[PDB]
Amino acid sequence: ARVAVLISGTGSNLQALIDSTREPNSSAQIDIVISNKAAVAGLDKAERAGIPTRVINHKLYKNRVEFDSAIDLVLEEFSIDIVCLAGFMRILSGPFVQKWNGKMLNIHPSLLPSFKGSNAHEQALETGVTVTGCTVHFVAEDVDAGQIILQEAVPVKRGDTVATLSERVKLAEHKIFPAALQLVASGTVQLGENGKICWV
Ligand SMILES: Nc1nc(=O)c2cc(CCCCc3ccc(C(=O)N[C@@H](CCC(=O)O)C(=O)O)cc3)sc2[nH]1
Numbered sequence: 470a471r472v473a474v475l476i477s478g479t480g481s482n483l484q485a486l487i488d489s490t491r492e493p494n495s496s497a498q499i500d501i502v503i504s505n506k507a508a509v510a511g512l513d514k515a516e517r518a519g520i521p522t523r524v525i526n527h528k529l530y531k532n533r534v535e536f537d538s539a540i541d542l543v544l545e546e547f548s549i550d551i552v553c554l555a556g557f558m559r560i561l562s563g564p565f566v567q568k569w570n571g572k573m574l575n576i577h578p579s580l581l582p583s584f585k586g587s588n589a590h591e592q593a594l595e596t597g598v599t600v601t602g603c604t605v606h607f608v609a610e611d612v613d614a615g616q617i618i619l620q621e622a623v624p625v626k627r628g629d630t631v632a633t634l635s636e637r638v639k640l641a642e643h644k645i646f647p648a649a650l651q652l653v654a655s656g657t658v659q660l661g662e663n664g665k666i667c668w669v
């Protein structure tokens with residue numbers, strides 16, 4: 470299966486995906502990395518790995534729909550099967566999401582359905598949970614509400630900050646994002662007709 474990875478920053482999850490998809494038994498290949506922001510570390514990671522990059526700055530398009538269209542055109546250019554959002558911090562439009570329904574994955578640094586949104590660690594710390602974690606899910610129109618593929622729990626330690634907690638949770642993200650990609654790319658897991666997760 471041919472994979473696009475969308476990023477907005479550092480790209481530690483991108484690197485984990487690059488590493489996993491180069492294993493001999495990988496059912497996924499990363500054929501394009503797309504960033505909405507320029508000069509981000511994730512782009513260096515892709516180039517260093519010999520993967521094509523495209524920057525599509527969302528601040529030259531009149532609205533959300535035509536920004537996504539610019540993404541979609543590139544996805545078509547590279548005959549993409551699966552899209553991974555890996556620290557991509559832009560909300561995608563309804564039609565774009567519907568087109569890629571069952572073919573687009575996202576990593577989120579909480580145990581969904583807890584702490585939806587862009588500041589999950591802040592929320593987890595404010596709430597006072599002693600167990601948080603991360604989630605890979607299919608992307609649906611409503612943010613962080615799509616069908617869950619894998620999760621991993623991660624303890625919160627006394628005195629944690631966003632810095633120390635995100636560091637711990639990223640270790641788990643780097644495990645379940647590649648595992649989830651392999652499950653979907655091999656056809657082992659799919660979004661079923663009834664919308665629920667189907668394990669074939
Ligand atoms: N349809 C859709 N479903 C998803 O499940 C999903 C997950 C994504 C991956 C990211 C999920 C977390 C996230 C939340 C909010 C924001 C955020 O700040 N959004 C802004 C607009 C974009 C921006 O300016 O940043 C806003 O609405 O104000 C950034 C990131 S994108 C996505 N799109």
Ligand SMILES: NCC(=O)N[C@@H]1O[C@H](COP(=O)([O-])[O-])[C@@H](O)[C@H]1O
Pocket residue numbers: 478479480481482483511555556557576577578586587588589639642
């Ligand atoms: N879905 C919103 C969100 O908070 N995403 C988070 O952004 C980070 C990107 O790190 P990376 O650039 O090193 O992969 C990841 O921790 C991911 O869970």
